[PDB]
Design a binder for this molecule. Structure first.
Ligand code: HEM
Ligand code: HEM
Lengths: 452, 452
């Protein structure tokens, strides 16, 4: 109990921490359940301890605005340091202070709307590939695992948009990439034993499978040498090094982040969306009518076409409210500060419980209900942008927010143009969330697929 | 050999490091001998590795000026982090960045000439006490250990000027203070195992004898409560908390630093000075003549009197050239920079080899000779202030430089007013330096003392 007396010294409520462990035993219900219990019990501000690390949760939109936007460069610049990282410390989502600001500025032009519209014809090709794989498992006439067909699509999209490697992941069990790209009782121990991280670093024990990273460092340098080109993420970073220019090892670190970003997140949300569309056939029918109205006759989706669909944007936003895959937003307090009326000491991790704020009765009518009409152009104005934060906010929000929304909507249009999705006897209704550290279904979502 | 390829990648020469160990095996001759060998062999700039930590040594006065003075606040602000520190991280000599700048500004008024002249009558009382203890061991008629009588004087001076505790350390074997204040195969292991420092911190293993610190935290709070006052270091810090105000635990951290500063450093240099005066009776006679001229008839020394003696200042400066007790000046490179023509990467410890620069034939005639006339008002102008740095330089130099010079000279005047010092059969001539990490004699200095 070295630092376990900080929150009661500041008059901040919270759960009573145990020695060494802190409040990590309260994670037996999960990250999200623990935050909703504390928010319902302690109010707008409370504190807890991840081992010996003090964490302060805030729910006031003005205070959230000050942390994420106002005092981002001055006070709340970085996220919590995590376990044996290794060379991936040069990744943008992990880098800190000026090292991050240099990487953020070197990668911001990559995600502009100009580069994004140039990627529409690429990620539309795999939308047709996704329809092909779905047409097979539909005539199979038995429940289909969504995270597999969506995971393949998300893997095909991210490898083509970042390396130009066009594969059929579901039908090619092992093109090298597919396998290497296809690749807790340890993070909990790291949280209770944070002093062991320097030991794992000097032992080169990288959490990343060290038996994979080298495969990309040579694959990238092969593509560097071998390079009618081109519109992939690698090229936009190759043309950038032509602040201070990037490094070749820094180049590989950002490539790995975009994959874990463009894979698990895209496929998970797409699975949550299709679960809600299957469990609400009225919403699925209305969405298919808007798709057929904007794209008559199964016309191919375009950049300007995707942005025109309002109900599609309403369906995506509502699923992200129920399932914000990040769960929490976190910032480290770099110095003794005093924001919006309260004093924040140095070293405290300021956390925004995004999952709990998205299901708070103070801001949402029937929080557990899936109601896309919350985000209609009539009701969207009564939604605080610092309560609904699926992509974060401020200078360090999701840099691939526009790419994620465009990639998911392009798949949703091509999928719903040809198929309807019904629950199966195997479908878990209602959907239970994973008890662990990730925001994923307890049971993988399986649904019945029928051709239109 | 993780980072052992940095200096050859930058084209910087230096000794070839061994895996894990680096160049620490070359310390078998000592810090100072290793620096003089590298300076004679590699030139003005070289690099080595303390384990895995890269260290770059510089000898150019313009480059030294840029590190210590010009880019102090921007680039070179802190010193190397060292081993399990504990609560003493709040000490000024250990604090970093704004935490140090707040402590440096809160302790700068303590060492002004106004506070220093107010301490002359206090540390002159123990000058008479030092004459008394010397008069006994002189009539003993046998060699006298200088570091004991000087250590007692230095201990009596620092406890009275920082807590008002007036004791006779040599004749009181244990007033609590004396003992508690009287209080490597481990620093070497920490250098090779720097990842174990977080382990020693969570185990509360403080290198400082944890069985002593608590004695001061309650002694200070006793003096806080019990307090015709007063001119001690504690009061100047008590009146300061009446930036952001100091803390009571921060108060104890600075108190421990001033003791280790005002004890071992004052007594060691005083012993080096009396060794040179004994081995050079001509210098000792000329110094006694200047003392008797400025202070006729064994008159008591005053503040204005000490500053008038030029040859005394020449004797002190020349001994500090031969024996700069700090040995090295060190600064951590906070960011990628490019000083005076060369690029310095982030994380590199920039080191100024003070001992090697003080004995360099490029700037000193007969470097091994003790010649006080180097600092006469005629020859003092040809001495580069960034080659002769016994107290460092810049915004983070020795904050107690004026106190150290005044305290040592006050003892030298009262000692030389009554006694002359001759070598004994036990006196080590010439004096060998300690083979370890400290700058102290190999054998404790013993001399024959005779009353005038
Ligand atoms: C449904 C999909 C996604 C969601 C909901 C999402 C959400 C988020 C959130 C909440 C953050 C943290 C924001 C903050 O802390 O304020 C974040 C960070 C980030 N995201 Fe995403 N993301 C998604 C997909 C992607 C994709 C596809 C990419 C890249 C291709 C990406 C790249 C990043 C990066 C690089 C960061 C860190 C930015 C930085 O540290 O400067 N994300 N994302
Ligand atoms: C012969 C006696 C002394 C010598 C030769 C000496 C020398 C030095 C040197 C070389 C430094 C490092 C400067 C740098 O890195 O640029 C230093 C730092 C320091 N010294 Fe001394 N010193 C002596 C006595 C004292 C005394 C008596 C005190 C206090 C009563 C003291 C307090 C300090 C402090 C606090 C620092 C660190 C300053 C900071 O980090 O801001 N020293 N000293």
């Amino acid at each position: 109990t070295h630092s376990h007396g900080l929150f009661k010294k500041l008059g901040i409520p919270g759960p009573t921490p145990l020695p060494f462990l802190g409040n990590i035993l309260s994670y037996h219900k999960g990250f999200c359940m623990f935050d909703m219990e504390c928010h319902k019990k302690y109010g707008k501000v409370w504190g807890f301890y991840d081992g010996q690390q003090p964490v302060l949760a805030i729910t006031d939109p003005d205070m959230i605005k000050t942390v994420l936007v106002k005092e981002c460069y001055s006070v709340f610049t970085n996220r919590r340091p995590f376990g044996p990282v290794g060379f991936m410390k040069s990744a943008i989502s992990i880098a800190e202070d000026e090292e991050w600001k240099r990487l953020r500025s070197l990668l911001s032009p990559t995600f502009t709307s100009g580069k994004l519209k140039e990627m529409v014809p690429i990620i539309a090709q795999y939308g047709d590939v996704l329809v092909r794989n779905l047409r097979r498992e539909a005539e199979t006439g038995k429940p289909v695992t969504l995270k597999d067909v969506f995971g393949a699509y998300s893997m095909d999209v991210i490898t083509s948009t970042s390396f130009g490697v066009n594969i059929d992941s579901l039908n090619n069990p092992q093109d090298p990439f597919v396998e290497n790209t296809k690749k807790d009782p340890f993070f909990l121990s790291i949280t209770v034993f944070p002093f062991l991280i320097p030991i794992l670093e000097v032992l080169n024990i990288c959490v990343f499978p060290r038996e994979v990273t080298n495969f990309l460092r040579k694959s990238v340098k092969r593509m560097k040498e071998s390079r009618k080109h081109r519109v992939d993420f690698l090229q936009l970073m190759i043309d950038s090094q032509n602040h201070k220019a990037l490094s070749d090892l820094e180049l590989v670190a950002q490539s790995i982040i975009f994959i874990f970003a463009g894979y698990e997140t895209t496929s998970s949300v797409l699975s949550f969306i299709m679960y809600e569309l299957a469990t609400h056939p009225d919403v699925q029918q209305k969405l298919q009518e808007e798709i057929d109205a904007v794209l008559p006759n199964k016309a191919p989706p375009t950049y300007d076409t995707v942005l025109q669909m309002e109900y599609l944007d309403m369906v995506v936003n509502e699923t992200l409210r129920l399932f914000p895959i990040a769960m929490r937003l976190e910032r480290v307090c770099k110095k003794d500060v005093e924001i919006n009326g309260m004093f924040i000491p140095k070293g405290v991790v300021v956390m925004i419980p995004s999952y709990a704020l998205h299901r708070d009765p103070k801001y949402w009518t029937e929080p557990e209900k899936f109601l896309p009409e919350r985000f209609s152009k009539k009701n969207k104005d009564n939604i605080d942008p610092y309560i609904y934060t699926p992509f974060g906010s401020g200078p360090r929000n999701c840099i691939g927010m526009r790419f994620a929304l465009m990639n998911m909507k392009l798949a949703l249009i091509r999928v719903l143009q040809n198929f309807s999705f019904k629950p199966c006897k195997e479908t878990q209704i209602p959907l239970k969330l994973s008890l662990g550290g990730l925001l994923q279904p307890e049971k993988p979502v399986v649904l019945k697929v029928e051709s239109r």
